């Protein structure tokens, strides 16, 4: 794979090659792939076999998980980014 | 995502943001998501794309796994919580 | 499972018994299995229950993931191998 606007990825602290879970709100498909930093603004392109799990225009949720110990958990603060129909940032909270 | 009664989550030692496996007994669906601490008593709400994998009223099993070394395994004791139709606690065993 | 030409596996730094994700471009199936080093040149054989998820002749993508810390991530360089219809190496890049 999934090419994500490098500027959008950065806000979500995603690294290129980082495994992410993709869930499609339109069709309910859930799959895993890895991040590819895009150069096109507002771009979210699904590449490879995963293309068969989505349709252009679908709304998706991209999630990144990390393995943490108890101390990391207590000090941890997730980066939750919300975007608009143009994949432009609307909000970026550090809490649920 | 899954919003779980914070009081119920605590009994299962679930932390907010903790990845959990959800298995639906009614339809057999199996998926992963993360925990959101709820404020409503006895509430278990599936949010996002996962809503398409369940029906309100379905019976589900929520599981949390942790990566342990051999010593942790030997000293480990799982928290198994059983609830009633109202998601009220019935039992909480520390063994299978 | 998946038996991979040991010579091809080596180029992708795959070890025997290493868990890998398989995604079938033809049918969109996505599953996990482990690597078995093959002795036959250009061979890619799917064994076990996974045989039902593919058809001989399908194009697939084999991926290996590793759990890394921040330092490992910064110094990390993925091995991306591209092959031809005969599973002969075409390219092996160290970047996306």
């Amino acid at each position: 794979x999934i090419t994500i606007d490098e500027d959008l990825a950065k806000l979500a602290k995603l690294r290129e090659g980082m495994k992410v879970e993709i869930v499609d709100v339109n069709n309910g498909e859930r799959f895993s792939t890895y991040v590819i930093l895009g150069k096109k603004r507002g771009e979210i392109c699904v590449n490879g076999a995963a293309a068969r799990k989505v349709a252009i225009g679908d709304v998706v949720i991209i999630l990144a998980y990390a393995s943490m110990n108890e101390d990391e958990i207590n000090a941890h603060k997730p980066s939750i980014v919300l975007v608009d129909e143009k994949n432009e940032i609307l909000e970026k909270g550090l809490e649920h | 995502x899954i919003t779980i009664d914070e009081d119920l989550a605590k009994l299962a030692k679930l932390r907010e943001g903790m990845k959990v496996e959800i298995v639906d007994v009614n339809n057999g669906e199996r998926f992963s998501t993360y925990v959101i601490l709820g404020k409503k008593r006895g509430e278990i709400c599936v949010n996002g794309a996962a809503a398409r994998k369940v029906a309100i009223g379905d019976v589900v099993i929520i599981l949390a796994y942790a990566s342990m070394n051999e010593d942790e395994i030997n000293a480990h004791k799982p928290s198994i919580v059983l609830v009633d139709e109202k998601n009220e606690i019935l039992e909480k065993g520390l063994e299978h | 499972x998946i038996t991979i030409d040991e010579d091809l596996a080596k180029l992708a730094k795959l070890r025997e018994g290493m868990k890998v994700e398989i995604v079938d471009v033809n049918n969109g199936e996505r599953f996990s299995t482990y690597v078995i080093l093959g002795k036959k040149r250009g061979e890619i054989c799917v064994n076990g229950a996974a045989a039902r998820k593919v058809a001989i002749g399908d194009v697939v993508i084999i991926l290996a993931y590793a759990s890394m810390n921040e330092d490992e991530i910064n110094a990390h360089k993925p091995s991306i191998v591209l092959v031809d219809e005969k599973n002969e190496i075409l390219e092996k890049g160290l970047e996306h």
């Binding site: 252009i56 998706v60 943490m68 939750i80 980014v81 975007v83 994949n87 | 932390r15 | -």
Partner: peptide, 24 residues
């Protein structure tokens, strides 16, 4: 002992393109 925890998420983004036969 470690647990997989939600690190980050991009909520409700729109897929702008798809490439089945992508190369790279």
């Amino acid at each position: 002992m470690t647990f997989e925890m939600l690190y980050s998420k991009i909520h409700r983004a729109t897929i702008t393109d798809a490439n089945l036969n992508y190369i790279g």
